[model samples]
Target: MIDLIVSQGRVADRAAWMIEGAARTARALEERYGLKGHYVGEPAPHADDDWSVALPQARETLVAVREAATESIKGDNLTVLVNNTCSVSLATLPVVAREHPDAVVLYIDGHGDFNTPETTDTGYLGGMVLSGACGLWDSGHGAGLRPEQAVLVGSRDIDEGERELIRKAGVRVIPPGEATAQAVLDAVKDAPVWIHIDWDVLEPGSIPADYTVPDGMLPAQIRAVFEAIPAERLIGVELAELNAPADSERAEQAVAVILDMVAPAFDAAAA
Candidate 1:
């Protein structure tokens, strides 16, 4: 049976608590699977405001964790990465593509993280992760994912700069309420799938996270999307941007629900 590999990536100061969330998710997944996740790599120190210093540190941590994850992908064993932020995808996605060239990335997020370094107004590296991994630009982390191999879902907030990039790339984008399993399978042509989720894709009041995009998916909708994916073809998953609060019953419940939603993939792996 294939076990899970949970790799925690770099964390920024604003998202420091996210690593704790990652740990909780990893532990929960371990419990559900009846197998321990061979976790590797601790989070980098909280990133500073200085872009010059912060960016390299983040890149270093991602690259380090990426290598660890890549080296661990032996045989048909599956992987599940718990990221401190979506920026970690800059490393993880490429690793997935390199390991499974036939894999199609099912990217679900509230914002289209397709911005390039040239077009970003915020200068946040996390905002440019998808484009970077797709070789739209050099993220200095890694790049192997081709633009055509990506299928975007539930992304409503698109920045003007990356809007043209998405169109030009011809990425199959499925909007909210339209992300059924059939739609995802059609977009990917039944290819083996790897999943990426930025937690803010959930409703504003649903989970604790840094960004709040209104009108996001509720638990049932999120579960439907999760269930729609072909479990046998599901290769891996990476979850980012959940900032779980400390000592709250509701927070624990939300986290548990999130885990339950993705349980199908794990169940398939165990089978």
Candidate 2:
């Protein structure tokens, strides 16, 4: 059985729309799979402008939230998490490491998210998730993930400092326009994978995202990447960074695309 969790952890900014968009995505997933989501944390009614000042508070919140998320896992069942920001990965990635020990992580995002505390230009906790989870930095969220066990896909807008860290960590990154299923299959090398997708990896026109980078994967390319992961080797999935849209029409369109991209994983879970 697939266990679904919808988390709205306020690591940085907290927009209610991020929660709302995630809820709608969870509902769609429920409708498709005929299962309800285990909701964690409440919506952010307001956002803090000075997130840097609240760094300590946010760290505490994420640690608490991660505990709740980790407790939700049961046995060998798959866990599908729909979260608002990439910061949520600090909570989920470690859970995957503990629960799905044999599974490698397939991280798909526009940015590398490999920035350490010292290297970060912006003090955004979300940008530090991968490094934190991989033990490159202290996230206070606990870490067991190995750097080499992750395969980065569709990352384009990487910071200079993050680039060297990613390189030295020996994380294999499949740049945009080259992340084919066969390429990914080769990269995973027959291991089960826990997929983490940040919606900003897509082209600006494809989804409403806060950090849109140029020259991202198209819809068809994204679908192909999903299709490449065989059902048997597909462990679980977490989608993040889809911002709330002003118009319902565009949001629904984006949802449809996301649902379609995740179809392969759901099919495997349902089986």
Candidate 3:
């Protein structure tokens, strides 16, 4: 029996709905496929007055949640780590790298998230997570990862710093404009890939999540990417920042799209 660990981060009003939506999705998956689901909730960090301070809270929550989840999944069973936070701290990557040494990480988001602390103009921790995973930044906290092992897909926006980080780290970036489901399939080919979907990666109108961007891929386009990617390569999949109350229309569509994408995988597992 495979385990689906859902990390519920505490946020104001919005988090409750996100947790509910996740629970609803998990139940749907259980009904469709007999996979067991587990929920792990972590206290959200206090809102930081500045972006620098904010990054640590995000980092701490991710580390704490992942560590607790890892302890629950020991004993020769496969595990997948999924990130649903609005922003992840660089400090969190080392924890994931150490705990899930064999797990594949698939970061699906609108931005490259490959910036280093020195290069980040917005000073947002999220922007530098990829870099931390790639071992580019010191992370002050002593957590980091190697880039070659981690695969980043569905990134549509790239700033100069992020671009440089990708080049230096040798991290693969599949732009939404060029990546069909087939392209992603080809990228992961035989390797296990844990999928992290930030709803903002969808086209602006298609998904009403934080950091919505223009020229986002359509649901069909995104689904095609999922379809082309082999299920064996999929360690786990996560949908972040659904913000249900803010945009029910987009949230419902997003849910439906996720179900469609994973249906085939669940069906295969049953067999």
Q: For each candidate, what TM-score against the reference?
A: 0.87, 0.88, 0.74
What is candidate 3's lDDT per residue for 1-271, written digit by digit as tens?
3556665554221233554555556655666666666666564433423445654445545566556545544433334333345443343455556755665566778888777767877665656666765667665545545576666766765876668768777778877777677777666656665566766677756335556544766677666766665656554555555555324565566566767866555454445
Predicted structure with the largest lDDT when compared to the true one: 2
Model 2 regions more than 4 Å off: 14-16, 45-73, 206-214, 245-247
Residue-pair clashes per candidate: 0, 0, 2
Per-residue error (Å), model 2, residue 7: 0.8
Cα displacement (angstroms), candidate 1, residue 38, comes to 3.6
In the range 89-167, model 2's lDDT, one tens digit per residue, is 8877888788777778989998898888788876677778899899988766778888889989999868777888999
In model 3, which runs have C-alpha deviations exceeding 4 angstroms? 11-24, 27-36, 42-52, 55-60, 68-83, 86-104, 138-144, 206-214, 246-250
The prediction achieving the highest TM-score against the true structure is: 2
Candidate 1, 33: how far from true, in Å?
Answer: 2.0
lDDT of 3 at 189: 55
Question: In candidate 1, which residue ranges exceed 4 Å CA deviation?
Answer: 7-9, 43-52, 206-214
